[PDB]
Structures are given as structure tokens and as C-alpha cells.
């Protein structure tokens, strides 16, 4: 199957109250494996998945040094950005960064990513060809120019198509029991009386992995929509995910509706009918 590795970085300035709050987290597909929190006692990159603990001291010392370097750069970025936008030295601002790679079913490089956001808005992003940048405003243009001269894209391309993919494969193997698995959803339907004229039918999908899933309602065959409510897929806390889809139906007509579940772990789509 296809897999991905992603690192997410968030740095928030808190002027007058010490250094910015920096949080870094690493993911392989839908499971987190490492984190770094500037406010944590350790001040070390820390494991968030037992399988990453198979990496030795050199890994942890090396990743700790590199994550602190990322923290340091973002600390400077916050200063640079407020300067770029002529903002007050007393306000709180946020810089976010994400980068990573995807591999196809062959586990060979598929695509790479490297982008930034300032105060919740796109700032600059590496394009798909991994050779050009996408800058929004004037400020981002300044950054772009600097990165082009510093050959940042060239170094990222080498990483994304090389080290990134190679280590992703290493992780996939070292944590195969959890990463290369598929947990089919456990499904059931609930009924909720809303009035003596109608009721809410809710289709649940629980304990599934990966997070990708499709839940849809149909009536006597036709596809229901706009009448169906969906919630964002959410974490159960045990490494698995949940999701539900609902539809308001007229009392006595419940059995006319059907829920359809599509998931990687299901040999074939599921169909649930109430009662």
C-alpha cells in the first residue's frame, strides 16, 4: 500500500514571557512516533510509539540536535516575520512548518512536501517538482529569493527523494505490526427519536485503521446527501479511529434507508439496514 511520513512544527511567540513555545511531532501515515515540546522537562526528542525505541542513542542524540535546530530557526523566523510585516513586539504570532514524503505501493518515492504558514495563512511552499517555490505576498518573495540563492530546494529534493523515503521504509519495517496493518471498522446503527413523525438514523464505524473511510446513506437505492450529517473522523485514543454518518428519516420508513461503509480493511463495501 501507499505510505507517508510527515513532520509538523508549531512555534508560538509569547513576548515578555520567555522563548516561543515550540512543538514538533512526527507521523508515519496516521500514527505518531515522535515529539519534542520546548516546555517539556526532557528537552529531548521523545518516542511516541514503542517501535521507534528500536533506534539507538545515536538516533536520539542526532534527532534531538536537529529538532532543537528547527526550534532555533523558528525562533528567529518569528522575529524576521514580525519585521517583514511591521508588527508590534508585544503581540503573539504563529509560525507553522510541515514537510515529508510519500511512497507508492512499491514503496518508491511518490511526492514530497515542504511548506510554511504565518499566523494560519500559507506563507511559502515547495512546488511538486521540488525545484520551485510558491510565495504569496512581498515578504514571502523575500524568503523565496534567499532560498533560491541558498539552494534550499536542491537540499530538500535530495532529502525528500533520498533520506526521507529511505527512513520511511525503515520505519514501516521496524513497526510493521502497527504500521502495515488494516483494522476493518466495527459497525452498528443507532436510532434516535426526534419526534412522533421522524427519527435520526446513525451509522457508526469504530476501531478502524487507517483513518481513510467513506460512509454514505441511500434510500430505496437513491443516494442521500445534504440530508445526511457527517462528523470529522476522530481518534479513539488507542491507535484506532471512529466516524459516524446520520440522516433524519420519517417514522415507519427507517428500513428504506441503508448505510454504506467503504474501507481499506473491508474485502468489500458494507451495507447496514436498520432493525
Amino acid at each position: 500500500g501507499s505510505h507517508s511520513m510527515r513532520y509538523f512544527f508549531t512555534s508560538v511567540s509569547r513576548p515578555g514571557r520567555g522563548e516561543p513555545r515550540f512543538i514538533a511531532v512526527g507521523y508515519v501515515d496516521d500514527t505518531q512516533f515522535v515529539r519534542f515540546d520546548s516546555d517539556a522537562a526532557s528537552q529531548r526528542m521523545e518516542p511516541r510509539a514503542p517501535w521507534i525505541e528500536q533506534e539507538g542513542p545515536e538516533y536520539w542524540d542526532g534527532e534531538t540536535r536537529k529538532v532543537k535546530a528547527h526550534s532555533q530557526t523558528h525562533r528567529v523566523d518569528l522575529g524576521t516575520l514580525r519585521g517583514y510585516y511591521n508588527q508590534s513586539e508585544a503581540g503573539s504570532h504563529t509560525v507553522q512548518r510541515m514537510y515529508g514524503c510519500d511512497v507508492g505501493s512499491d514503496w518508491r518515492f511518490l511526492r514530497g512536501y515542504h511548506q510554511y504558514a504565518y499566523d494560519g495563512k500559507d506563507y511559502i511552499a515547495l512546488k511538486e517538482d521540488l525545484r520551485s517555490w510558491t510565495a504569496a505576498d512581498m515578504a514571502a518573495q523575500t524568503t523565496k529569493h534567499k532560498w533560491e540563492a541558498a539552494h534550499v530546494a536542491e537540499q530538500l529534493r535530495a532529502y525528500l527523494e533520498g533520506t526521507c523515503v529511505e527512513w520511511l521504509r525503515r520505519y514501516l519495517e521496524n513497526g510493521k505490526e502497527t504500521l502495515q496493518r488494516t483494522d476493518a471498522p466495527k459497525t452498528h446503527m443507532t436510532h434516535h427519536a426526534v419526534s412522533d413523525h421522524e427519527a435520526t438514523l446513525r451509522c457508526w464505524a469504530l476501531s478502524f485503521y487507517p483513518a481513510e473511510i467513506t460512509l454514505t446513506w441511500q434510500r430505496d437505492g437513491e443516494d442521500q446527501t445534504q440530508d445526511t450529517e457527517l462528523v470529522e473522523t476522530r481518534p479513539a485514543g488507542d491507535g484506532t479511529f471512529q466516524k459516524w454518518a446520520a440522516v433524519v428519516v420519517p417514522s415507519g420508513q427507517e428500513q428504506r434507508y441503508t448505510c454504506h461503509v467503504q474501507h481499506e480493511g473491508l474485502p468489500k463495501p458494507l451495507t447496514l439496514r436498520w432493525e
Binding site: V67, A69, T73, D77, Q155, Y159
Partner: peptide
Amino acid sequence: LLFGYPVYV
């Protein structure tokens, strides 16, 4: 594994 080249905006 993390990218090892420090980058500044």
C-alpha cells in the same frame, strides 16, 4: 528522520 539543513525565512 529529520531534515538536517537549517533553513531561515
